[PDB]
Amino acid sequence: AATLQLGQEFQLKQINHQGEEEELIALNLSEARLVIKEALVERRRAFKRSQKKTREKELESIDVLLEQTTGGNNKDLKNTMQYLTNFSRFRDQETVGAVIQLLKSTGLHPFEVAQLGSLACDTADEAKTLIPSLNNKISDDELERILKELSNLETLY
Amino acid sequence: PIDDIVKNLLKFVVRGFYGGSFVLVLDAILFHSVLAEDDLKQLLSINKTELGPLIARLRSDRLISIHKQREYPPNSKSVERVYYYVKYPHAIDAIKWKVHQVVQRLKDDLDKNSEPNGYMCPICLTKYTQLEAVQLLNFDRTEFLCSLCDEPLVEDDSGKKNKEKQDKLNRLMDQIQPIIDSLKKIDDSRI
Amino acid sequence: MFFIKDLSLNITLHPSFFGPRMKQYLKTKLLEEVEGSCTGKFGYILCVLDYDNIDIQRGRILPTDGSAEFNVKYRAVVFKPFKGEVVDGTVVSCSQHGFEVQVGPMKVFVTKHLMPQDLTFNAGSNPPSYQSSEDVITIKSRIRVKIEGCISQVSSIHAIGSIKEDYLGAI
Ligand SMILES: [Zn+2]
């Protein structure tokens, strides 16, 4: 369950389609929307290429634009985008990139590093109540350190 | 002294949870330390079949021990007596833990009647898990319909039997009340 | 929970589409049936990355049906629930014994026994909401939902959420 017990399809050794071992890659609400729209950029980029021969509104107004770009029946993807904007709290990808560099410094398993980014809390104890994974892997003080650093980055856009 | 309380200790188990005659077999153990089975058969005028299992209840519950009284009579015949020995400290072992687990068991039915677990479609004769439930509740619905009856369910393991078990628990403590400290009275010496 | 994933798909291409431009229809169907789909094994398949560099290697013609069989490997992002996990959400409709919290693409239900006792159900309210000692939790309310159970059925994942614990109910 939520205690680092994930299936074969979600092991650390996520073999890329080139056939070699690689680390499991998870995504929190700190990268999901900022990668989905970016990929949609490529999608519309080819969509017009081969055709030749706050954050809230930037979410949905462009969601409909890429609904034009996509097949449009994936409105549940739009639900996910909405869920992101309502609860994904990063921007200016270098922001979250510094965050992730710090979390790489944390020596935390990528599941846990995603747990941190996804959750927006105040104390180490709140995390331990929500993330039994993140209770002792680092000093709880360091937990609050990085929680506070997030709160510094916790700015609504 | 303490061993006398052990002598009386098994009487608690024997005269409460068994019939009247069960102490009549136990009494004979206290009556004669080396209690010959052939004699104990005559003492209560019970036949071989009737006396047999009575010792087993005392044997199995570590209360008695049928010691193989092999000996050589004058006639040189195969002489055997089931000498019902009194293993006082080991019978304490049997009474001690038997009081231990029963208190847990009557507690178990209480918690089960406070946490509904499953469901039931009494129309389609189908019980459901909550995961089963979350499959046929419609977003236009408030209770999970069925697939054979397409009808709502009923919660399973509700709290109408909860009060039944507390009396059993209370009756357990009030009836085991003479037994609990009678063991600990002996356990002061640990003999 | 969101993951970047590399998935392999086998797509059957009916013979009529055997133009010089087969890969057109190929990528087409890939998107048409992979983005935004539910799997019991990977969770809702949200979006596909690298629309161009997709391994499309070689067809096989099924011995009958003459339809080519293609084994597409591609890299995408999926959303997967897990038991015991903590999420946000918002209700959609009401139930007599709990409420169904739309956690993004998927809707997570919280049952009557899954809620704290003080959170009682008001049927009279419109919409019938769930009222705690401190919180009246309604359709648009933001609920901190914890994922208790998950259904791994192919094409349909169902999640059991509960607010009986702390830090739950309203976010
Ligand atoms: Zn039925």
Side-chain angles (χ1 to χ4, degrees), chain A, chain B residues 1-62 73-74 87-191, chain C:
Chain A
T3 95
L4 277 170
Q5 314 176 2
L6 304 186
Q8 333 166 287
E9 327 305 322
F10 309 99
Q11 290 199 62
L12 77 166
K13 299 142 187 161
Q14 284 319 301
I15 298 94
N16 57 44
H17 283 159
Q18 298 72 353
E20 61 271 6
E21 184 203 354
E22 184 259 337
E23 180 147 42
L24 171 51
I25 307 306
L27 264 223
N28 45 26
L29 282 317
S30 83
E31 257 151 322
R33 182 167 35 74
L34 323 170
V35 173
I36 284 171
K37 192 192 163 188
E38 157 257 348
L40 286 159
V41 163
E42 264 52 46
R43 178 157 313 182
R44 176 198 63 262
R45 194 180 213 80
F47 162 89
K48 301 175 184 172
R49 165 178 299 99
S50 39
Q51 183 183 35
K52 293 184 66 62
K53 223 50 193 300
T54 168
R55 59 208 193 97
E56 281 210 3
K57 326 307 296 177
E58 292 177 349
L59 173 85
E60 53 171 355
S61 52
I62 314 184
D63 284 352
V64 192
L65 292 173
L66 295 149
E67 209 154 351
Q68 165 258 25
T69 296
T70 60
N73 50 294
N74 196 358
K75 74 151 192 300
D76 335 14
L77 165 61
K78 298 315 162 64
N79 312 346
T80 333
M81 303 320 291
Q82 300 164 19
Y83 187 93
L84 278 148
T85 280
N86 301 19
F87 316 101
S88 186
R89 306 83 38 188
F90 272 80
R91 208 58 32 72
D92 312 7
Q93 25 273 29
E94 293 62 22
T95 304
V96 224
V99 181
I100 290 293
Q101 171 61 258
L102 300 181
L103 298 162
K104 293 306 160 184
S105 343
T106 62
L108 288 180
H109 179 265
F111 173 86
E112 334 172 283
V113 328
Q115 297 306 305
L116 294 173
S118 73
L119 291 200
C121 277
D122 320 325
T123 95
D125 182 28
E126 311 175 347
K128 299 180 266 183
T129 56
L130 301 187
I131 308 171
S133 313
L134 284 155
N135 71 290
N136 50 7
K137 318 302 169 309
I138 205 51
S139 103
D140 283 311
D141 158 65
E142 293 177 279
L143 288 187
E144 278 115 0
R145 286 195 304 96
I146 319 181
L147 283 147
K148 294 180 302 276
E149 290 150 7
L150 283 200
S151 62
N152 307 137
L153 315 161
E154 283 336 283
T155 302
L156 186 65
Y157 322 91
Chain B
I2 292 298
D3 209 324
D4 305 358
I5 299 183
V6 195
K7 303 174 187 60
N8 292 344
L9 171 83
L10 328 182
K11 300 175 117 305
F12 259 167
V13 184
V14 175
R15 288 173 321 192
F17 297 78
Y18 309 161
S21 70
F22 281 81
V23 68
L24 278 48
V25 168
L26 170 67
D27 284 335
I29 276 191
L30 309 172
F31 286 167
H32 272 284
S33 44
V34 44
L35 169 66
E37 185 196 26
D38 309 333
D39 290 324
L40 168 55
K41 168 191 172 61
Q42 322 287 2
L43 155 60
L44 314 166
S45 287
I46 50 186
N47 298 87
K48 293 286 292 185
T49 58
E50 286 183 333
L51 182 135
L54 306 185
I55 338 283
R57 188 68 67 183
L58 296 173
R59 278 200 317 169
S60 59
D61 304 323
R62 211 158 184 155
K87 299 258 77 183
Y88 305 97
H90 297 270
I92 297 155
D93 292 356
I95 312 170
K96 281 189 306 174
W97 185 44
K98 284 181 181 177
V99 182
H100 190 193
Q101 63 170 246
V102 184
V103 185
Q104 294 189 26
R105 294 206 212 176
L106 290 172
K107 213 97 167 189
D108 271 306
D109 322 330
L110 215 82
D111 277 319
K112 168 180 52 177
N113 290 129
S114 65
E115 180 73 7
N117 289 126
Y119 265 91
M120 56 262 314
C121 170
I123 332 100
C124 55
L125 300 81
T126 314
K127 325 291 164 281
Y128 292 81
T129 83
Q130 250 76 332
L131 286 81
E132 297 189 29
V134 300
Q135 313 300 137
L136 310 184
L137 167 78
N138 312 76
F139 318 91
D140 52 83
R141 282 282 290 103
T142 60
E143 193 162 27
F144 339 90
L145 293 180
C146 154
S147 176
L148 346 165
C149 275
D150 294 89
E151 296 170 46
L153 332 168
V154 189
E155 298 180 8
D156 182 21
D157 287 323
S158 55
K160 197 172 210 302
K161 320 180 190 179
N162 202 11
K163 304 292 185 170
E164 309 176 7
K165 313 304 176 296
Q166 197 43 61
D167 302 314
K168 308 174 177 57
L169 280 157
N170 275 32
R171 279 170 294 196
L172 185 61
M173 172 54 184
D174 301 332
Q175 300 328 305
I176 227 68
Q177 241 168 352
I179 313 186
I180 48 175
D181 295 338
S182 303
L183 289 166
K184 286 201 302 304
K185 176 72 178 181
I186 299 168
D187 293 328
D188 306 327
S189 287
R190 292 296 292 187
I191 307 177
Chain C
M1 184 173 185
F2 298 67
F3 303 79
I4 300 163
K5 207 62 181 191
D6 293 23
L7 294 189
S8 93
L9 187 54
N10 295 354
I11 308 183
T12 281
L13 198 254
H14 172 285
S16 46
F17 312 86
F18 281 29
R21 59 142 123 280
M22 48 178 181
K23 309 182 172 304
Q24 219 58 75
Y25 316 74
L26 245 188
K27 302 180 178 181
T28 291
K29 306 257 285 200
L30 164 78
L31 303 194
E32 271 285 318
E33 304 113 41
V34 171
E35 295 254 346
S37 178
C38 178
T39 138
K41 199 169 194 181
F42 299 119
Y44 312 92
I45 318 127
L46 324 164
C47 167
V48 191
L49 5 166
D50 189 339
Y51 173 85
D52 283 0
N53 320 90
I54 318 184
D55 167 61
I56 192 188
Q57 62 299 58
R58 261 266 227 267
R60 198 170 50 91
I61 323 285
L62 302 180
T64 112
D65 334 332
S67 53
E69 193 30 69
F70 281 104
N71 170 34
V72 147
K73 288 198 279 209
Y74 70 103
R75 153 186 211 84
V77 166
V78 286
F79 166 72
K80 189 62 188 301
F82 306 93
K83 305 86 207 138
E85 215 171 27
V86 196
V87 306
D88 298 321
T90 308
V91 207
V92 167
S93 67
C94 164
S95 92
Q96 75 94 353
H97 34 214
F99 60 107
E100 184 177 14
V101 204
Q102 174 104 55
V103 181
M106 63 166 313
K107 309 170 191 176
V108 177
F109 182 73
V110 184
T111 328
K112 218 53 198 63
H113 321 84
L114 278 52
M115 292 145 28
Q117 306 80 357
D118 71 324
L119 190 73
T120 52
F121 170 57
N122 301 9
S125 44
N126 178 20
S129 50
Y130 286 86
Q131 291 66 17
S132 164
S133 289
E134 59 179 4
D135 303 315
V136 178
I137 303 195
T138 66
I139 281 189
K140 264 202 51 55
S141 54
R142 303 199 171 183
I143 315 100
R144 178 141 295 192
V145 223
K146 173 185 171 302
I147 311 167
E148 329 292 345
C150 313
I151 264 303
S152 311
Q153 207 122 191
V154 33
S155 328
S156 70
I157 296 189
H158 298 62
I160 271 66
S162 85
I163 45 193
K164 190 191 311 304
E165 283 185 6
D166 54 357
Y167 304 78
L168 303 187
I171 308 178

Short mmCIF file of all heavy atoms in Angstrom, two decimals, chain B residues 122-157:
data_model
loop_
_atom_site.label_atom_id
_atom_site.label_comp_id
_atom_site.label_asym_id
_atom_site.label_seq_id
_atom_site.Cartn_x
_atom_site.Cartn_y
_atom_site.Cartn_z
N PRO B 122 -30.43 -9.02 0.00
CA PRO B 122 -31.37 -10.08 0.40
C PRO B 122 -32.41 -10.38 -0.65
O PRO B 122 -33.18 -11.34 -0.49
CB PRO B 122 -32.01 -9.52 1.68
CG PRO B 122 -31.89 -8.04 1.53
CD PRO B 122 -30.60 -7.80 0.81
N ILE B 123 -32.48 -9.59 -1.72
CA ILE B 123 -33.40 -9.88 -2.80
C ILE B 123 -32.76 -10.84 -3.80
O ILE B 123 -33.36 -11.84 -4.20
CB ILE B 123 -33.85 -8.57 -3.48
CG1 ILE B 123 -33.81 -7.41 -2.47
CG2 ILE B 123 -35.24 -8.74 -4.06
CD1 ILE B 123 -32.58 -6.54 -2.58
N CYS B 124 -31.53 -10.54 -4.22
CA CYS B 124 -30.78 -11.41 -5.11
C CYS B 124 -29.98 -12.46 -4.36
O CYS B 124 -29.21 -13.19 -4.99
CB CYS B 124 -29.85 -10.58 -5.98
SG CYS B 124 -28.78 -9.53 -5.02
N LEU B 125 -30.13 -12.53 -3.04
CA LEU B 125 -29.42 -13.49 -2.20
C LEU B 125 -27.91 -13.35 -2.37
O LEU B 125 -27.18 -14.33 -2.52
CB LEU B 125 -29.86 -14.93 -2.50
CG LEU B 125 -31.30 -15.39 -2.33
CD1 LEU B 125 -32.15 -14.99 -3.52
CD2 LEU B 125 -31.33 -16.90 -2.13
N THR B 126 -27.45 -12.10 -2.34
CA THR B 126 -26.03 -11.87 -2.58
C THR B 126 -25.47 -10.90 -1.56
O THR B 126 -25.96 -9.78 -1.41
CB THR B 126 -25.78 -11.32 -3.98
OG1 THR B 126 -26.52 -12.09 -4.94
CG2 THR B 126 -24.30 -11.41 -4.31
N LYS B 127 -24.43 -11.35 -0.87
CA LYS B 127 -23.69 -10.50 0.05
C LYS B 127 -22.55 -9.82 -0.70
O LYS B 127 -21.99 -10.39 -1.64
CB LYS B 127 -23.16 -11.34 1.21
CG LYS B 127 -24.10 -12.46 1.61
CD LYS B 127 -25.36 -11.91 2.25
CE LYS B 127 -26.48 -12.94 2.30
NZ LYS B 127 -27.16 -13.07 0.98
N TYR B 128 -22.23 -8.60 -0.29
CA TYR B 128 -21.27 -7.80 -1.03
C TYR B 128 -20.22 -7.25 -0.09
O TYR B 128 -20.50 -6.98 1.08
CB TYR B 128 -21.94 -6.64 -1.76
CG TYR B 128 -22.83 -7.05 -2.91
CD1 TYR B 128 -24.12 -7.50 -2.68
CD2 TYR B 128 -22.38 -6.97 -4.22
CE1 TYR B 128 -24.93 -7.87 -3.73
CE2 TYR B 128 -23.19 -7.34 -5.27
CZ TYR B 128 -24.46 -7.79 -5.02
OH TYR B 128 -25.28 -8.16 -6.07
N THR B 129 -19.00 -7.11 -0.60
CA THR B 129 -18.00 -6.29 0.06
C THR B 129 -18.25 -4.83 -0.27
O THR B 129 -19.02 -4.49 -1.18
CB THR B 129 -16.60 -6.69 -0.37
OG1 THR B 129 -16.28 -6.05 -1.61
CG2 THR B 129 -16.50 -8.19 -0.55
N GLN B 130 -17.59 -3.94 0.47
CA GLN B 130 -17.65 -2.53 0.13
C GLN B 130 -17.06 -2.29 -1.26
O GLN B 130 -17.59 -1.49 -2.04
CB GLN B 130 -16.91 -1.71 1.18
CG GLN B 130 -17.82 -0.84 2.06
CD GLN B 130 -18.57 -1.63 3.13
OE1 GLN B 130 -18.85 -2.82 2.96
NE2 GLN B 130 -18.90 -0.97 4.23
N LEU B 131 -15.98 -2.99 -1.58
CA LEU B 131 -15.47 -2.91 -2.94
C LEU B 131 -16.50 -3.44 -3.94
O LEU B 131 -16.69 -2.84 -4.99
CB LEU B 131 -14.16 -3.68 -3.07
CG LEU B 131 -12.93 -3.02 -2.45
CD1 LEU B 131 -12.87 -3.26 -0.96
CD2 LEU B 131 -11.66 -3.52 -3.12
N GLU B 132 -17.17 -4.54 -3.61
CA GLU B 132 -18.31 -4.96 -4.41
C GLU B 132 -19.35 -3.85 -4.49
O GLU B 132 -19.96 -3.62 -5.54
CB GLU B 132 -18.95 -6.22 -3.83
CG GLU B 132 -18.06 -7.44 -3.81
CD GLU B 132 -18.82 -8.68 -3.43
OE1 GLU B 132 -20.03 -8.75 -3.71
OE2 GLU B 132 -18.21 -9.60 -2.84
N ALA B 133 -19.55 -3.16 -3.37
CA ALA B 133 -20.55 -2.10 -3.35
C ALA B 133 -20.20 -0.99 -4.34
O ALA B 133 -21.04 -0.58 -5.14
CB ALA B 133 -20.68 -1.55 -1.93
N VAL B 134 -18.94 -0.56 -4.35
CA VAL B 134 -18.60 0.67 -5.04
C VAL B 134 -18.63 0.45 -6.54
O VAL B 134 -18.29 1.34 -7.32
CB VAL B 134 -17.22 1.21 -4.60
CG1 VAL B 134 -17.22 1.50 -3.11
CG2 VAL B 134 -16.14 0.23 -4.95
N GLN B 135 -19.05 -0.74 -6.96
CA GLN B 135 -19.13 -1.04 -8.38
C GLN B 135 -20.51 -0.79 -8.97
O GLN B 135 -20.61 -0.53 -10.17
CB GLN B 135 -18.75 -2.51 -8.63
CG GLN B 135 -17.48 -2.93 -7.93
CD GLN B 135 -16.27 -2.13 -8.35
OE1 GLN B 135 -15.45 -1.72 -7.53
NE2 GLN B 135 -16.14 -1.91 -9.65
N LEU B 136 -21.57 -0.85 -8.17
CA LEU B 136 -22.92 -0.75 -8.69
C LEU B 136 -23.70 0.42 -8.12
O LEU B 136 -24.86 0.61 -8.49
CB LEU B 136 -23.68 -2.05 -8.43
CG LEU B 136 -22.94 -3.32 -8.86
CD1 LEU B 136 -23.82 -4.54 -8.64
CD2 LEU B 136 -22.50 -3.23 -10.31
N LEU B 137 -23.10 1.20 -7.22
CA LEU B 137 -23.66 2.50 -6.90
C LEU B 137 -23.54 3.40 -8.12
O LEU B 137 -22.44 3.61 -8.64
CB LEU B 137 -22.91 3.12 -5.73
CG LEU B 137 -23.18 4.60 -5.49
CD1 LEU B 137 -24.52 4.77 -4.81
CD2 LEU B 137 -22.06 5.23 -4.69
N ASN B 138 -24.66 3.94 -8.56
CA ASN B 138 -24.65 4.87 -9.68
C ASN B 138 -24.40 6.28 -9.17
O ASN B 138 -24.78 6.62 -8.05
CB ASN B 138 -25.98 4.83 -10.44
CG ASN B 138 -26.42 3.42 -10.77
OD1 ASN B 138 -26.90 2.69 -9.90
ND2 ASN B 138 -26.27 3.03 -12.03
N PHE B 139 -23.75 7.10 -10.00
CA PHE B 139 -23.63 8.52 -9.67
C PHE B 139 -25.00 9.16 -9.53
O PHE B 139 -25.14 10.20 -8.88
CB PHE B 139 -22.80 9.24 -10.74
CG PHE B 139 -21.61 8.47 -11.20
CD1 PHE B 139 -21.70 7.61 -12.29
CD2 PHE B 139 -20.39 8.59 -10.57
CE1 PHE B 139 -20.61 6.90 -12.72
CE2 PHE B 139 -19.29 7.88 -11.00
CZ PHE B 139 -19.40 7.03 -12.08
N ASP B 140 -26.01 8.55 -10.14
CA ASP B 140 -27.40 8.93 -9.96
C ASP B 140 -28.03 8.21 -8.77
O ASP B 140 -29.25 8.27 -8.58
CB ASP B 140 -28.19 8.63 -11.23
CG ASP B 140 -27.98 7.21 -11.71
OD1 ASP B 140 -28.66 6.30 -11.19
OD2 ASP B 140 -27.12 7.00 -12.59
N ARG B 141 -27.22 7.53 -7.96
CA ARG B 141 -27.73 6.68 -6.89
C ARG B 141 -26.98 6.95 -5.60
O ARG B 141 -25.88 7.52 -5.59
CB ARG B 141 -27.62 5.19 -7.25
CG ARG B 141 -28.71 4.70 -8.19
CD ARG B 141 -30.02 4.48 -7.47
NE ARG B 141 -29.95 3.33 -6.57
CZ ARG B 141 -29.82 3.42 -5.26
NH1 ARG B 141 -29.74 4.60 -4.67
NH2 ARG B 141 -29.76 2.32 -4.52
N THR B 142 -27.60 6.55 -4.50
CA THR B 142 -27.07 6.73 -3.16
C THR B 142 -26.83 5.42 -2.44
O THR B 142 -26.19 5.41 -1.38
CB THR B 142 -28.03 7.59 -2.34
OG1 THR B 142 -29.31 6.95 -2.26
CG2 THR B 142 -28.20 8.97 -2.97
N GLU B 143 -27.33 4.31 -2.98
CA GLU B 143 -27.07 2.99 -2.44
C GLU B 143 -26.77 2.06 -3.60
O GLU B 143 -27.42 2.12 -4.65
CB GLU B 143 -28.24 2.47 -1.61
CG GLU B 143 -27.92 1.24 -0.76
CD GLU B 143 -28.95 1.03 0.35
OE1 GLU B 143 -30.11 1.45 0.17
OE2 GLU B 143 -28.58 0.45 1.39
N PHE B 144 -25.80 1.18 -3.41
CA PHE B 144 -25.27 0.36 -4.49
C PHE B 144 -26.34 -0.64 -4.91
O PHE B 144 -26.71 -1.53 -4.15
CB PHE B 144 -24.00 -0.34 -4.03
CG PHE B 144 -23.35 0.33 -2.85
CD1 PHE B 144 -23.69 -0.03 -1.56
CD2 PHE B 144 -22.41 1.32 -3.04
CE1 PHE B 144 -23.09 0.58 -0.49
CE2 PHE B 144 -21.81 1.94 -1.97
CZ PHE B 144 -22.15 1.57 -0.69
N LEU B 145 -26.85 -0.49 -6.13
CA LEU B 145 -27.79 -1.45 -6.67
C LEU B 145 -27.11 -2.80 -6.85
O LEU B 145 -25.93 -2.99 -6.53
CB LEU B 145 -28.38 -0.95 -7.98
CG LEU B 145 -29.27 0.29 -7.90
CD1 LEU B 145 -29.79 0.68 -9.28
CD2 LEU B 145 -30.42 0.05 -6.94
N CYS B 146 -27.85 -3.77 -7.35
CA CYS B 146 -27.33 -5.12 -7.57
C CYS B 146 -27.10 -5.37 -9.06
O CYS B 146 -27.27 -4.49 -9.90
CB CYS B 146 -28.29 -6.16 -6.98
SG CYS B 146 -28.21 -7.78 -7.77
N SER B 147 -26.66 -6.59 -9.37
CA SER B 147 -26.50 -7.03 -10.74
C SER B 147 -27.45 -8.16 -11.12
O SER B 147 -27.71 -8.35 -12.31
CB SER B 147 -25.06 -7.49 -11.01
OG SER B 147 -24.93 -8.01 -12.32
N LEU B 148 -27.96 -8.91 -10.15
CA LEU B 148 -29.02 -9.87 -10.41
C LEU B 148 -30.38 -9.31 -10.08
O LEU B 148 -31.35 -9.61 -10.79
CB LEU B 148 -28.80 -11.14 -9.59
CG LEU B 148 -27.41 -11.30 -8.96
CD1 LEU B 148 -27.44 -12.38 -7.90
CD2 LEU B 148 -26.39 -11.63 -10.04
N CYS B 149 -30.48 -8.50 -9.03
CA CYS B 149 -31.70 -7.80 -8.71
C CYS B 149 -31.65 -6.33 -9.07
O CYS B 149 -32.71 -5.70 -9.18
CB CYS B 149 -32.02 -7.93 -7.22
SG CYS B 149 -32.92 -9.41 -6.80
N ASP B 150 -30.46 -5.76 -9.31
CA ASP B 150 -30.29 -4.33 -9.54
C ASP B 150 -30.99 -3.52 -8.46
O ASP B 150 -31.71 -2.56 -8.73
CB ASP B 150 -30.76 -3.94 -10.94
CG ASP B 150 -29.89 -4.55 -12.02
OD1 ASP B 150 -30.19 -5.68 -12.46
OD2 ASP B 150 -28.90 -3.90 -12.41
N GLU B 151 -30.78 -3.94 -7.22
CA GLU B 151 -31.42 -3.38 -6.05
C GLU B 151 -30.38 -3.09 -4.98
O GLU B 151 -29.33 -3.73 -4.94
CB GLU B 151 -32.48 -4.34 -5.51
CG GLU B 151 -33.62 -4.56 -6.47
CD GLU B 151 -34.52 -5.67 -6.03
OE1 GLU B 151 -34.88 -5.70 -4.83
OE2 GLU B 151 -34.87 -6.53 -6.86
N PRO B 152 -30.66 -2.13 -4.10
CA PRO B 152 -29.68 -1.76 -3.08
C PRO B 152 -29.37 -2.92 -2.15
O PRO B 152 -29.99 -3.99 -2.19
CB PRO B 152 -30.37 -0.61 -2.33
CG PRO B 152 -31.42 -0.12 -3.26
CD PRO B 152 -31.88 -1.31 -4.01
N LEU B 153 -28.39 -2.70 -1.30
CA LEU B 153 -27.94 -3.71 -0.36
C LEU B 153 -28.34 -3.35 1.06
O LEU B 153 -29.07 -2.39 1.32
CB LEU B 153 -26.43 -3.88 -0.44
CG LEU B 153 -25.84 -3.53 -1.80
CD1 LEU B 153 -24.34 -3.44 -1.67
CD2 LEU B 153 -26.24 -4.57 -2.82
N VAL B 154 -27.86 -4.16 2.00
CA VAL B 154 -27.99 -3.91 3.43
C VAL B 154 -26.61 -3.99 4.04
O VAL B 154 -25.78 -4.80 3.61
CB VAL B 154 -28.95 -4.92 4.10
CG1 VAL B 154 -29.24 -4.51 5.54
CG2 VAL B 154 -30.22 -5.09 3.28
N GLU B 155 -26.34 -3.15 5.03
CA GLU B 155 -25.09 -3.26 5.76
C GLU B 155 -25.05 -4.57 6.53
O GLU B 155 -26.06 -5.04 7.06
CB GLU B 155 -24.93 -2.08 6.72
CG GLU B 155 -24.87 -0.73 6.03
CD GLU B 155 -24.70 0.41 7.01
OE1 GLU B 155 -24.48 0.15 8.21
OE2 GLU B 155 -24.79 1.58 6.58
N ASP B 156 -23.86 -5.17 6.58
CA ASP B 156 -23.64 -6.43 7.27
C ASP B 156 -22.92 -6.17 8.59
O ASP B 156 -22.13 -5.24 8.71
CB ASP B 156 -22.81 -7.39 6.41
CG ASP B 156 -22.60 -8.74 7.07
OD1 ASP B 156 -23.39 -9.09 7.97
OD2 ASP B 156 -21.64 -9.44 6.70
N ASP B 157 -23.22 -7.01 9.58
CA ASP B 157 -22.61 -6.94 10.91
C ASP B 157 -22.87 -5.58 11.56
O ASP B 157 -21.96 -4.79 11.83
CB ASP B 157 -21.10 -7.23 10.84
CG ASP B 157 -20.81 -8.69 10.58
OD1 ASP B 157 -21.54 -9.54 11.13
OD2 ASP B 157 -19.85 -9.00 9.84
#
